[PDB]
Design a protein around this ligand. Structure first.
Ligand SMILES: [Cl-]
Length: 216
C-alpha cells in the first residue's frame, strides 16, 4: 500500500467564529509511516479577527499509522471507501465549536473540506483577543461502538500570553462507508498522543502535527 497511502494534501477550511465568516485554503504534506503533517493556509477573506489557534487541532488521520499496520483511516483511504468526520468542542467559558469534514482522494493526494461553526466566545476572552500562544500535548481515546463508527474523546488545553490555560473537551465521530476490519474492533480502546505547532500572521499560518498511537 506504500503508493496508495497519502503523501500530500490540501485543506479548505471555512465557516464562522461568533457569526463572522472566514475562509482559508492551502497545501500540505505528511508522512503516513510516522504521523507527521505540515500545512500552510492563507485567508481568502482578509485578516482573521480571532486567534488562528482556534483552528487547531481541526486543521487528516489518513497520516496516522497504527502500531501493527494501517489505521482504519488509512485502510478506508487506500480502498477508496472513505469516512466522514464530525467534531464538537465545548469550552470552559461556555463556547462551542463544531466542524464537519469531507475528503476526496487523487492517488496519494488528499483534498479536505472542513466546515466550522464557533459560537459564544466572550469578546474580552483569549480567542477573540488573539491571546492564545501554544497547545498542550493531548491524549485521545478511540472506541468502536459498531463496525462503521469510531468515537474519539479528549481534553484540550491552550496556553495564553498571560500564562493561563484555556481548556475544552472534545468528542469526534467517524462514520465509515464499509465495515472496519475485525482486528480494530477487538483491539480497543486505542490511544493517541499528539502535539501541534502553529506559527501565524493575520492572513497566513504554518501548522505541524505529530501523532503516535498506542494500546498497553
Ligand atoms: Cl480526533
Amino acid at each position: 500500500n506504500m503508493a496508495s497511502l497519502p503523501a500530500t494534501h490540501e485543506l479548505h477550511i471555512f465557516g464562522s467564529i461568533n457569526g463572522v465568516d472566514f475562509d482559508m485554503v492551502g497545501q500540505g504534506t505528511g508522512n503516513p509511516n510516522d504521523g507527521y503533517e505540515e500545512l500552510n493556509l492563507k485567508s481568502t477573506k482578509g485578516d482573521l479577527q480571532f486567534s488562528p489557534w482556534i483552528l487547531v487541532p481541526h486543521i487528516f488521520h489518513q497520516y496516522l499509522p497504527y502500531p501493527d499496520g494501517m489505521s482504519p483511516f488509512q485502510a478506508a483511504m487506500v480502498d477508496g471507501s472513505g469516512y466522514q468526520v464530525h467534531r464538537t468542542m465545548q469550552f470552559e467559558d461556555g463556547a462551542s465549536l463544531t466542524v464537519n469534514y469531507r475528503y476526496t482522494y487523487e492517488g496519494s493526494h488528499i483534498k479536505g473540506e472542513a466546515q466550522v461553526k464557533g459560537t459564544g466566545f466572550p469578546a474580552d476572552g483569549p480567542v477573540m483577543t488573539n491571546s492564545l500562544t501554544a497547545a498542550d500535548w493531548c491524549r485521545s481515546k478511540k472506541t468502536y461502538p459498531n463496525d462503521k463508527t469510531i468515537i474519539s474523546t479528549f481534553k484540550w488545553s491552550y496556553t495564553t500570553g498571560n500564562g493561563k490555560r484555556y481548556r475544552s473537551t472534545a468528542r469526534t465521530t467517524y462514520t465509515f462507508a464499509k465495515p472496519m476490519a475485525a482486528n480494530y474492533l477487538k483491539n480497543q480502546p486505542m490511544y493517541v498522543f499528539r502535539k501541534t505547532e502553529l506559527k501565524h500572521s493575520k492572513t497566513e499560518l504554518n501548522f505541524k502535527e505529530w501523532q503516535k498511537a498506542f494500546t498497553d
